[PDB]
Symmetry: D2
């Protein structure tokens, strides 16, 4: 059974970049919905697995096929938002401060500068044509190199792709404050990105 | 734990429309792979579920997300092939004979004739751009009306879309015999379609 | 060059069901974005098509492939919103009034009642996991039968699936008024659905 | 108008790794189908484009949406196969010989060895659940770093992802020789991969 994670900051601590009203809805309603949906999906899979074991029919296999979509969607919603809150922080907790150490070295070597990486990520965010996410990732399969990837809906990065910074591009992440002005949101959010957490994720490779 | 279903006919019973060599590989290799993959994926889900209950971390949920794809793909492969074998039959067992009862009525009313429904299905099959399936379905949500739908890979028809006839359009379903000539396969298969099973599925409104 | 369509109603005319604030942003900003993106994509097509004629290389075909997604997405956004505005009307212009003629007959025959069709549509809307649309359609391939289809992003219904009622499920269609309470929006919108236009589309069997 | 490209080798030249029977069908039938489909789709879109200029209706935009699917699929089929023939070669033309220069240095730095990159690519190929491709790519957006990406159907790599080696995982690429033994085909194909072409693509970007 999963639950909402503890936040490291108060709902209004990311103002003026992200409003307290958005954070409260985003956490208490949206993230909670994924929590509930994931727990439900996993319970349903347990029931269907037990059913399939005693009656291993195509009919019962078809029922299991039907709920894996919910496990993927709600599981992704649960995990993506957990990553998101952990890579946000108010300026008083280091939000917006550049990364140091090995991550900073890799960023300059690969993208030239942090600003160039941020600009690339904002282009990737703008290019999400629907609901989705951008992630700055470390790829463990190609020698640990940085990349920026897009996902749709609540799809996430798995396997050798370790998420370092997750940025939510669903309209509920910004609409109450920015309405249609999504580039203003993508620009603003970097002021409260926690690069210390990004560096930790980079160093651990988890 | 799932297993290969019993066949209602021998591998060579659908000759010359579908070769015995294809049926043998299709069943003993391809369908078996989905059986194994599905069993493995469900066991893996179980293992991860037990772990999540003790450590409900985002990291463990992430692992479960990865396994979902395999449950979907192999579960689909298992289910779709089971449907496929059950809607094929040699002529001696009624393969190629038209449906009767309520299904026959519905077909003429919606498509004009069985031949027109078959033509539409062959167009849908030709339109699969990659691996996939076409299904003649009964839609329980719109008053039980017939339709033809396409799926990709091992996606299948679920919920209110009840499969009546499943036709495999993966290249392994025909390539050894027809090579690139996929429309020849799509034309040929109707000679061994089991419309009695289709009628049964239509009446039952379920698998 | 495509442009924003004329609206048949004032921005605030669908209140209380959809706020004037939402309609104004939805039309002047969101729909405009798709108009701009589609015009840009088509111009880019033309440039690349000309280039390909002179230099029919894989590299140039690769550039053409890259632009296809923008044509699809923005084309869909343009088309879907045009459909949407035309199937909404204030109560004073008949919004919420049931369809008549051949469409009303089809609805009762397939769904039992208009209420049952609306409930199905709301379930399909609720099932959109991300941004998307639901469409009540007439399927020209199966004898003209009604159905409800979901799409994601700005995917749309093409070919034999003729849209009769389009309902937008993107968060921008409701969030300023309803926030997370998407089912309340899906319930409310029917009060301003223009079933006369749905009937017109049903009879025409085209856009 | 696109056409089938010239091959640099005879149909049977890749035996015993890929049969002449397969190459002949794969080129003269399958690739030709994509050539024809792409030409048809581009012509259709041009007609619709000229029409939209005079009648910029939702009805006409809807027709254009329908055609783009064929542009993507057949365009991908056309380009992916062009890449494929150019990154295959018989042993007599250097097939199977390791890359050199900058590409070889990048491979060792990122993957440890060519063998390790090949093993990774084979895992990516094995993971294609349906028809599709694996590509070894140079990513121009992250400093030119190598990666391996999977695509489905005739989807391809575009923009900053430069294809260096394309490997076809559609069943028609192997079934006549390997039938269900897809992993054996993935293992075998490296004996006729043209890494000289891969190195050229890497250096050019
Ligand atoms: Mn969110
Ligand atoms: Mn099959
Ligand atoms: Mn909209
Ligand atoms: Mn091929």
């Amino acid at each position: 059974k999963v639950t909402l994670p503890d936040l490291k900051w108060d709902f209004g601590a990311l103002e003026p970049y992200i409003s307290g009203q958005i954070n409260e809805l985003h956490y208490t309603k949206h993230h909670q919905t994924y929590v509930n949906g994931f727990n439900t999906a996993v319970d349903q899979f347990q029931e269907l697995s037990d059913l399939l074991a005693k009656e291993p029919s195509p009919a019962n296999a078809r029922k299991m096929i039907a709920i894996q979509q919910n496990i993927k969607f709600h599981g992704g919603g649960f995990t993506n938002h957990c990553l998101f809150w952990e890579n946000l922080a108010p300026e008083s907790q280091g939000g917006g401060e550049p990364p140091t150490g090995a991550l900073a070295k890799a960023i300059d070597e690969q993208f030239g500068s942090l600003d160039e990486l941020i600009k690339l990520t904002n282009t990737k965010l703008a290019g999400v044509q629907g609901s989705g996410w951008a992630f700055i990732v470390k790829n463990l399969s190609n020698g640990g190199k940085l990349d920026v990837v897009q996902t749709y809906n609540q799809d996430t990065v798995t396997g050798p792709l370790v998420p370092l910074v997750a940025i939510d591009a669903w309209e509920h992440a910004y609409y109450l404050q920015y309405q249609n002005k999504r580039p203003d949101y993508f620009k603003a959010i970097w002021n409260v990105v926690n690069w210390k957490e990004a560096s930790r994720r980079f160093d651990a490779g988890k």
